[PDB]
């Protein structure tokens, strides 16, 4: 089957491009001087944008599809969400977890997402969801490379056998070590928990992704320990701080001091715009803070930052179709990244930057890489974002794994007219 | 042609419903006890939701489709936007305005919007855009009932001949009298401008819609004058305060006092979530306020509030496809109206509440009303909102004026599977 992608636009490049495929890899990328004809074994991008696959750097596949079960959250807070989740966690079964994880994973495949990092709550002696997710990881592997992050949701030091269970999760095969220092009983447990997390990541050679300062508390500064420990161990690339919503509330002087360390450390940041706008600012009356981390500033400083969906129809977020362009849309608005170039470059926040966060080794439209790429029916990132386009084709190992025939809208004026909303 | 809409769901009602049509009107609405068969002259809603048309209570059709012309905004502020617009206004032609207005109007027809209130800048001795828009109003009338609001963008008292031009606009046929008291040189000009606006509305028997306190200034309280004058004249239904973003920044005590007047006055409020999240909070560093008016509180108090798109690809907002479900999505998130019922009832903010704001006399799925209705391929408001569904059919005077064949997404697993993102 497929030998070429033709008539492709590429972000930050002029003109049209031909992507040659061989043995499941990209063999060569060649500029075109005009439109190429279609032929058998050519997939025509039709002057749409070709990008490496969307990435979901932060989702909770063990909580997905449980919104309102057994009860709703309600106050719309992180803290009530954890309480509601704890009630649902007591009701987990193996098949329950696999079915719900797979439901969301199919939406993700449909949405051109080929790389997903799922957190899985390991504050659970039975490790029910983890055992299920390890099977799901193997099952979905033809379509999605799933990383599993062992997430000690109720604390490492603040939950019975929390450290032991976290380590057990790694011994069972979790790819990433998690932590939640702002949810530990004390600041000292918070800091200690990070030492323990880093020690485990080094013992097992695993990545780190900390739920870090997800709280509107200007004194929640666990991020400095995450970055300092990464710098000390020389392991920045392998380390991620998720959320860091407290950073929205820091004074500017501390933030400036901190940013030097953040860039030196080389650690990654995940913002979760759909969830953060909902859960943050809940303790303000009016005015009410936005509560997303300092994405615009990170980008300006060359600090790697990217966007996750976080929860899809779960205890913290009742909405979602696991759509990364939608996540991006919310983040651009709330972060005021609304300049033409900022919007256009927005795709990086859900592609390349997220690949870096996942420490991916085979990602991007480049000769020698696996032929994993998606085609958006749009002229550039700005257009894709504005029109919230579907993924026309998703290609993995040089084979089509998803396609969307786009909607067709007609208005019946003096004559019928097709409406495509371009611009 | 059409005699019936069958298999219809209706918000806040159980089961399925049949809507009988005669002579361009709804003749009767009858409950069904099961699914009805299709037949010729029946439009099958297919257990989707049937609602009266979407409404756009606040857009600027004279500025639409001009983003970046001749220059970009940039700081992303209201104030720079006005400066950029002033540069574009100097370049207006009759045909320019008509073509751009019509481009956005077609997107609106496609999006099931049958009622639109456009502001038109009348701080312009030539009244170029107004004259063009009055023609557009007549031209689009088969598909959209367009209200024209004379908008003294540069002030009534603060712009040469501002009051005369505003009155000239009414004499030429503008439906609604506008004002912009927070942009007047002084608080006293602000208050005086409102007296003059009310006097004109009473002289000409027109509606009022004030760009009111669109500024992060806790001292911008022109809304109390708008409400008090409406109450005094007994004309609440005819009066709207657009934006009121300053209200996001008021102390709670004043707001409580004010709310009594707001409910007694009976005036309408328009929030513009996509634009407000972008333009407000621009003078904060961190934390940064959201800057939308007190929508949740208004709803809790039974104060009529609704959502507009405001600007579509214009000097204040570079994005948009004139999509009301998208506007609604942003507003629910930023306003934290994220409870299941709050999300589900969200449709009211872009249907019934907006009809009230426009003082519409023939609106809603009721016997005797014009057969103006749209069909969403969704089970209820929550589902429509979550999945950002298109308008399957738009019906006006009992005739189909727009339709969307929805996207078709397939994932190629062990077997091909259709993906619809339900839930
Ligand atoms: Fe999370
Ligand atoms: Fe406006």
UniProtKB/Swiss-Prot annotation, chains A, B:
GO CC annotations, alphabetized: cytosol
Site (Activates the nucleophilic water): 243
Catalyses which reaction(s): cytosine + H2O + H(+) = uracil + NH4(+); isoguanine + H2O + H(+) = xanthine + NH4(+)
Effect in UniProt of substituting residue 310 to A: Less than 0.01% of wild-type enzymatic activity
CDD domains per record: Bact_CD (cd01293)
Keyword terms of this UniProt record: Cytosine metabolism, Hydrolase, Iron, Metal-binding, Zinc
Entry-linked InterPro entries: Amidohydro_3 (IPR013108), Metal-dep_hydrolase_composite (IPR011059), Metal_Hydrolase (IPR032466), Metallo-hydrolase_Enzymes (IPR052349)
Gene3D superfamilies in the cross-refs: Metal-dependent hydrolases (3.20.20.140), Urease, subunit C, domain 1 (2.30.40.10)
Keyword Hydrolase assigned: yes
Biotech utility: Cytosine deaminase is being explored for use as a suicide gene for cancer gene therapy. The cytosine deaminase/5-fluorouracil combined therapy has been used successfully for a variety of animal tumor models and is currently under investigation for the treatment of human cancers.
Active site residues according to the UniProt entry: 214
Catalytic class of the enzyme: hydrolase
Binding of Fe(2+), residues: 58, 60, 211, 310
Keyword Zinc set for record: yes
Phenotype caused by lack of the gene: Cells lacking this gene have less than 1% of the isoguanine deaminase activity of the wild-type strain.
Stated pH dependence: Activity is lost under pH 5 but not affected up to pH 10.
Pfam family, one: Amidohydro_3
GO molecular function: cytosine deaminase activity; ferrous iron binding; identical protein binding; isoguanine deaminase activity; zinc ion binding
NCBIfam families: PRK07572.1, PRK09230.1
PANTHER family xrefs: CYTOSINE DEAMINASE
Stated role: Catalyzes the hydrolytic deamination of cytosine to uracil. Is involved in the pyrimidine salvage pathway, which allows the cell to utilize cytosine for pyrimidine nucleotide synthesis. Is also able to catalyze deamination of isoguanine, a mutagenic oxidation product of adenine in DNA, and of isocytosine. To a lesser extent, also catalyzes the conversion of 5-fluorocytosine (5FC) to 5-fluorouracil (5FU); this activity allows the formation of a cytotoxic chemotherapeutic agent from a non-cytotoxic precursor.
Family, per entry: Belongs to the metallo-dependent hydrolases superfamily. Cytosine deaminase family.
Protein name, per record: Cytosine deaminase
Gene: codA
């Amino acid at each position: 089957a497929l030998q070429t992608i033709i008539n492709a636009r590429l972000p930050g490049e002029e003109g049209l491009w031909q992507i040659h495929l061989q043995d499941g890899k990209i063999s060569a990328i060649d500029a075109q001087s005009g439109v190429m004809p279609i032929t058998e074994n050519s997939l025509d991008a039709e002057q749409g944008l070709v990008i490496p696959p969307f990435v979901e750097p932060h989702i909770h596949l063990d909580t997905t599809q449980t919104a309102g079960q057994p009860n709703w959250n309600q106050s719309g807070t992180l803290f009530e969400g954890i309480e509601r989740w704890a009630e649902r966690k007591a009701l987990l079964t193996h098949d329950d977890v696999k079915q719900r994880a797979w439901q969301t994973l199919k939406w993700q495949i449909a949405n051109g997402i080929q790389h997903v990092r799922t957190h899985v709550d390991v504050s659970d002696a039975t490790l029910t969801a983890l055992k299920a997710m390890l099977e799901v990881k193997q099952e979905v592997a033809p379509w999605i490379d799933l990383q599993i992050a062992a997430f000690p949701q109720e604390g490492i030091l603040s939950y019975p056998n929390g450290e032991a269970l976290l380590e057990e999760a790694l011994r069972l095969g979790a790819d990433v070590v998690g932590a939640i220092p702002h949810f530990e009983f004390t600041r000292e447990y918070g800091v200690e928990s990070l030492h323990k997390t880093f020690a485990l990541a080094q013992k097992y050679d695993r990545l780190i992704d900390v739920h870090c300062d997800e709280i509107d508390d200007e004194q929640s500064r666990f991020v400095e320990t995450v970055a300092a420990l990464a710098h000390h161990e020389g392991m920045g690339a392998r380390v991620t701080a998720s959320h860091t919503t407290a950073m929205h509330s820091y004074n500017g002087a501390y933030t400036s001091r901190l940013f030097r360390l953040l860039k030196m450390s080389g650690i990654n940041f995940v913002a979760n715009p759909l969830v953060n706008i909902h859960l943050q600012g809940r303790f303000d009356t009016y005015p009410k803070r936005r509560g997303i981390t300092r994405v615009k500033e990170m980008l300006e400083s060359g600090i790697n930052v990217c966007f996750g969906h976080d929860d899809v129809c779960g205890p913290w977020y009742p909405l979602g179709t696991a759509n990364m362009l939608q996540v991006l849309h919310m983040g651009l608005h709330v972060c005021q990244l609304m300049g033409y170039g900022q919007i256009n470059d927005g795709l990086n926040l859900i592609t390349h930057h997220s690949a870096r966060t996942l420490n991916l080794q085979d990602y991007g439209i480049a000769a020698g890489n696996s032929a994993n790429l998606i085609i958006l029916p749009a002229e550039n990132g700005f257009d894709a974002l504005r029109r919230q386009v579907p993924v026309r084709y998703s290609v993995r190992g040089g084979k089509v794994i998803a396609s969307t025939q786009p909607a067709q809208t007609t208005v019946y004026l003096e004559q019928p007219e097709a409406i495509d909303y371009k611009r």
